Design a protein around this nucleic acid. Structure first.
Length: 798
RNA sequence: GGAGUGUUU
C-alpha cells in the first residue's frame, strides 16, 4: 500500500495513427538552481502584493544583493535564481516600502536539474525540481495576467446574474519519458462582472431599474440576494468580504457606536453615513451587507459597494451553463489553432526569465503515435440474437432486441402536469408509441396501463404511491410526467427509491406531446435495466483473459458541494458488478465530511458489494478491479494509502485467507491534455476529433509509471477530452494492452445509451449514484441517503 | 430520453 508499479510494457494493439498533443518540449540545462525562502511580514498578504513586494525589492537592492540576476517568485515564500545570490548560508533582513514590509531572505537548497534528467530515464521524479521549473515558466505571466489556479486570464460575454465568461489559458510543466513538457491549453471560466451592488441586485432579482423596488425587499427576495452575494468581495466608492445580508433596511439597521464621552449608543447605518460621511443614502429602504467577522457589526449600504473585479465564480443556472457551453465549445482543428496562437503570443524563447534559466521551448506540438483499439462486439438477444458492431463509437438497436428483456404486464401512469397541457389523447398516443418501440426492443409492454391519473404538488407523490403498491399486485413501473424543472422530481425519487421499493421513470411533458422513436428507444433502455433486465452484453468470446476467473469491477466517485458553503456533506458512492457479462451493478452510497476526498467508509461499502456479488453469482472474486474517479495527482498517495488498505480490510473482515488481486486505477477527465489528428482524413465528424478508441501510452505519459490516455468516446461537439488512467496498484500484473482493451470494453457496457462513453461504466454509475443522492437530500442525512431493501439490489440510478 | 462539450461599522 505504498508505491505505484512500474510500466509493465507498451501497448501494441490497434491500428496506428499520427497525433499531435498540446505538449511542447522543454530543453533544460543541467545547471543547479538556487532556492531561497522569503518570510515577509505581514505574512498573510495576497500573492499579488507579495509579488509586488518582491518586484520592488529586487530592483531596490540590485546594487548590493541581486545584481544582474533575474529571480523568479512563486507568490508565497519561494524565490529562485539561475545563479547563487551573494548571501551565503546566512539570513538577511531587509525593509520594503510600497506600505512597509519586513522581508527576510535565506538560502535553503540547491535544486539539481541534473537530478531531474536522470529521473527522466529510470531512477524511479523529484517534485521540488518540477515545481521550480513551473515557477520559472509562469513567473512572467503571473505579473502580466490574473492568475487563477494554473490558469491566466485578462478582461476582454455575459451569462446573466452578474456573470461573465473570460477567456484565458492553462499552463503547467509536466514530466515525460525523456524530456520536460510544457502543457498549454485554452481556458474559459465564469467571472462576476465588476459592478455596483445595486446593479448586481437588479440582475439577480431581474430589475431593469432599481427604482422599480421603491419598497423594502420581501423575505423571498432578500434570501435569493443573500445566496448570490455571500462570500463575495466588495469595495468602497477598501476591500471587504460579504458574510451575510441584513434583515433590516439601512434606515433601521443599528450598531453600537461609542461616543467621545465613553458611553456607547445604538446608531443606524443610515444616520451614521449621514453624520460621518455626509451621505444621505439614496436607497435607505434596502438592506446592508454584513462584512467582517460577524462580531464586527460592520454593515455597508448597497449603494456604496461594488463587486470587486477578477472574482471567479464558484453553481451556475442551467441557462448560464448553456450559454457558457455555447461560447466555449469549438472544433478540434480550431482549438489546435488557438493553442498555436497562444504559443505565438506567449513567445517563451524571448521571455527574459526563462532565458535567464537557459530554458528553451519547442514551438510545435509533440508528435505522438496513437493506437485505435478495436471496439468490442455487442451481443443482443431476442429471436435473432443480433450482434452489433460499434462504428465511430456508436451503434443502434435497429433489428435488435434486449439480451434479457422484461415483459411488462402491470404498470401505471402518474401525470404531474395540467390535464389541458398533457391531455388524455397525449397519454394515449404516447402509450401507443411506447408500446410499439418496446415491442421491437424485446421489452414487450403487453397491454394498456392498469392505472392512469392526474396530480400536482410534491405532497401528492407519496400517498398516490402508497396506493399503487398495495392495490396492484406485481406493479412493475410507474411512469411520471413532469412539467419542466419542478422540484417534485426529487420527491418522486425519494419515495420511489427510499420509502417504497418502486421503480419510477420520469419524462418531461414536452417529450410526451411530441414523441420520436429515438427518444422512446432511449427511454426503453432505462426502463429495462430498472426492472432487472439486461439490455446487452459484451461478446463473451471477445473479452480479455481477466474474465477467465470470477472478477468484480468497482467504480468509485465522490461529489462535493460548493466550497465554502459548508455544513453540506460530500457524497461518496461505490458500485460493483454483479455478473460475469459484466452488466448489472449494485450501488452503495454514503454521506461524509464536507469536501473530504477520501472515501471514509470504503471498507464497509466494499464489503457490502462483495457480499452481494457472492449472493448473485455464488462466486468469490479472485480479482478486484477498482476504477477511482475524481482524484488529482497531488492526492494519489493519500487516496492510495487509505483506500487500498480499506479494500484489503474488507476482504480480511470477510474471511481470513481471502486475498484477491487488486488493481487500483485512477480515472481523470479534469486535465488539459488534448490530442489532434495529424492527418485530416482521420478526423471524425464536424468537430474533427480523434476517433473513438485512440490510445496513447508513450511520449506524453509518465516516465516510469503505468498510465495511459484513452479517448473511448466519439466527440459530438467541441474538442474531446481523452480520459487518463493511472494505475496506482496492480497485484494482477496486467499488460498494457489487456488493461487498455479492458477499460475500453467497459466503456461499451454503459446501459443508458448505445454509445461508447468517455469513462468505464462502473465509474460512470458511481457518479450517477452520488448524483441521485443529491436529490435524496447527521444520522438523518445518512438515513435520507439510505435506499429501500427492495431498491437496494436494483439499478435505480439509471 | 441520451451522450458529448465549458468549469472601521
Amino acid at each position: 500500500a505504498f508505491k505505484p508499479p512500474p510500466r509493465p510494457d507498451f501497448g501494441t494493439s490497434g491500428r496506428t495513427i499520427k497525433l499531435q498533443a498540446n505538449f511542447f518540449e522543454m530543453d533544460i540545462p543541467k545547471i543547479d538552481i538556487y532556492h531561497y525562502e522569503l518570510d515577509i511580514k505581514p505574512e498573510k498578504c495576497p500573492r499579488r502584493v507579495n509579488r509586488e513586494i518582491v518586484e520592488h525589492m529586487v530592483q531596490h537592492f540590485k546594487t548590493q544583493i541581486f545584481g544582474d540576476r533575474k529571480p523568479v517568485f512563486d507568490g508565497r515564500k519561494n524565490l529562485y535564481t539561475a545563479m547563487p545570490l551573494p548571501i551565503g548560508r546566512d539570513k538577511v533582513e531587509l525593509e520594503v516600502t510600497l506600505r512597509i514590509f519586513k522581508v527576510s531572505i535565506k538560502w535553503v537548497s540547491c535544486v539539481s536539474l541534473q537530478a531531474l534528467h536522470d529521473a527522466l530515464s529510470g531512477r524511479l521524479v523529484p517534485f521540488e525540481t518540477i515545481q521550480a521549473l513551473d515557477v520559472v515558466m509562469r513567473h512572467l505571466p503571473s505579473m502580466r495576467y490574473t492568475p487563477v489556479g494554473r490558469s491566466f486570464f485578462t478582461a476582454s460575454n455575459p451569462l446573466g446574474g452578474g456573470r461573465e465568461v473570460w477567456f484565458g489559458f492553462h499552463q503547467s510543466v509536466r514530466p515525460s519519458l525523456w524530456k520536460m513538457m510544457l502543457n498549454i491549453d485554452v481556458s474559459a471560466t465564469a467571472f462576476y462582472k465588476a459592478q455596483p451592488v445595486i446593479e448586481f441586485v437588479c440582475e439577480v432579482l431581474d430589475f431593469k431599474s432599481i427604482e422599480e423596488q421603491q419598497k423594502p425587499l420581501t423575505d423571498s427576495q432578500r434570501v435569493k440576494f443573500t445566496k448570490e452575494i455571500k462570500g463575495l468581495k466588495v469595495e468602497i466608492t477598501r476591500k471587504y468580504r460579504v458574510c451575510n445580508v441584513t434583515r433590516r433596511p439601512a434606515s433601521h439597521q443599528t450598531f453600537p457606536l461609542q461616543q467621545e464621552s465613553g458611553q456607547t449608543v445604538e446608531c443606524t447605518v443610515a444616520q451614521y453615513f449621514k453624520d460621518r460621511h455626509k451621505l444621505v443614502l439614496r436607497y435607505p429602504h434596502l438592506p446592508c451587507l454584513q462584512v467582517g467577522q460577524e462580531q464586527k457589526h460592520t454593515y455597508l449600504p448597497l449603494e456604496v459597494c461594488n463587486i470587486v473585479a477578477g472574482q471567479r465564480c464558484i453553481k451556475l443556472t442551467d441557462n448560464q451553463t448553456s450559454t457558457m457551453i455555447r461560447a466555449t465549445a469549438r472544433s478540434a482543428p480550431d482549438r489546435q489553432e488557438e493553442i498555436s496562437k497562444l504559443m505565438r503570443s506567449a513567445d517563451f524563447n524571448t521571455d527574459p526569465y526563462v532565458r535567464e534559466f537557459g530554458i528553451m521551448v519547442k514551438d510545435e506540438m509533440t508528435d505522438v503515435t496513437g493506437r485505435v483499439l478495436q471496439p468490442p462486439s455487442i451481443l443482443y438477444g431476442g429471436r435473432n440474437k443480433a450482434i452489433a458492431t460499434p462504428v465511430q463509437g456508436v451503434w443502434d438497436m435497429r433489428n435488435k432486441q434486449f439480451h434479457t428483456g422484461i415483459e411488462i404486464k402491470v404498470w401505471a401512469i402518474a401525470c404531474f402536469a395540467p390535464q389541458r397541457q398533457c391531455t388524455e389523447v397525449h397519454l394515449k398516443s404516447f402509450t401507443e408509441q411506447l408500446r410499439k418501440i418496446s415491442r421491437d426492443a424485446g421489452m414487450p409492454i403487453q397491454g394498456q396501463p392498469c392505472f392512469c391519473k392526474y396530480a400536482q404538488g410534491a405532497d401528492s407523490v407519496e400517498p398516490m404511491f402508497r396506493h399503487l403498491k398495495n392495490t396492484y399486485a406485481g406493479l412493475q413501473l410507474v411512469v411520471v410526467i413532469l412539467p419542466g424543472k419542478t422540484p417534485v422530481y426529487a420527491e418522486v425519487k425519494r419515495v420511489g427509491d427510499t420509502v417504497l421499493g418502486m421503480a419510477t421513470q420520469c419524462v418531461q411533458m414536452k417529450n410526451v406531446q411530441r414523441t420520436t422513436p429515438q427518444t422512446l428507444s432511449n427511454l426503453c433502455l432505462k426502463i429495462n435495466v430498472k426492472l432487472g433486465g439486461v439490455n446487452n452484453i459484451l461478446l463473451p468470446q471477445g473479452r480479455p483473459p481477466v474474465f477467465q476467473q470470477p472478477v468484480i469491477f468497482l467504480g468509485a466517485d465522490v461529489t462535493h458541494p460548493p466550497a465554502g458553503d459548508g455544513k453540506k456533506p460530500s457524497i461518496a458512492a461505490v458500485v460493483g458488478s454483479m455478473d460475469a457479462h459484466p452488466n448489472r451493478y449494485c450501488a452503495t452510497v454514503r454521506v461524509q465530511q464536507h469536501r473530504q476526498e477520501i472515501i471514509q467508509d470504503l471498507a464497509a461499502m466494499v464489503r457490502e458489494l462483495l457480499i452481494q456479488f457472492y449472493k448473485s453469482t455464488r462466486f468469490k472474486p479472485t480479482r478486484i478491479i477498482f476504477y477511482r474517479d475524481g482524484v488529482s495527482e497531488g492526492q494519489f498517495q493519500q487516496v492510495l494509502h487509505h483506500e487500498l488498505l480499506a479494500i484489503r480490510e474488507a476482504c480480511i473482515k470477510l474471511e481470513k485467507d481471502y486475498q484477491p488481486g487488486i488493481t487500483f486505477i485512477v480515472v481523470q477527465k479534469r486535465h488539459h491534455t488534448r490530442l489532434f489528428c495529424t492527418d485530416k482524413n482521420e478526423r471524425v465528424g464536424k468537430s474533427g476529433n480523434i476517433p473513438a478508441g485512440t490510445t496513447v501510452d508513450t511520449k506524453i505519459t509518465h516516465p516510469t509509471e503505468f498510465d495511459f490516455y484513452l479517448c473511448s468516446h466519439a466527440g459530438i461537439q467541441g474538442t474531446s477530452r481523452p480520459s487518463h488512467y493511472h494505475v496506482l496498484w496492480d497485484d494482477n500484473r496486467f499488460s498494457s494492452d489487456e488493461l487498455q482493451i479492458l477499460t475500453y470494453q467497459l466503456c461499451h457496457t454503459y446501459v443508458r445509451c448505445t454509445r461508447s462513453v468517455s469513462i468505464p461504466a462502473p465509474a460512470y454509475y458511481a457518479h450517477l449514484v452520488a448524483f441521485r443522492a443529491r436529490y435524496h437530500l447527521h444520522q438523518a442525512l445518512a438515513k435520507a441517503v439510505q435506499v429501500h431493501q427492495d431498491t437496494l439490489r436494483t439499478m435505480y440510478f439509471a
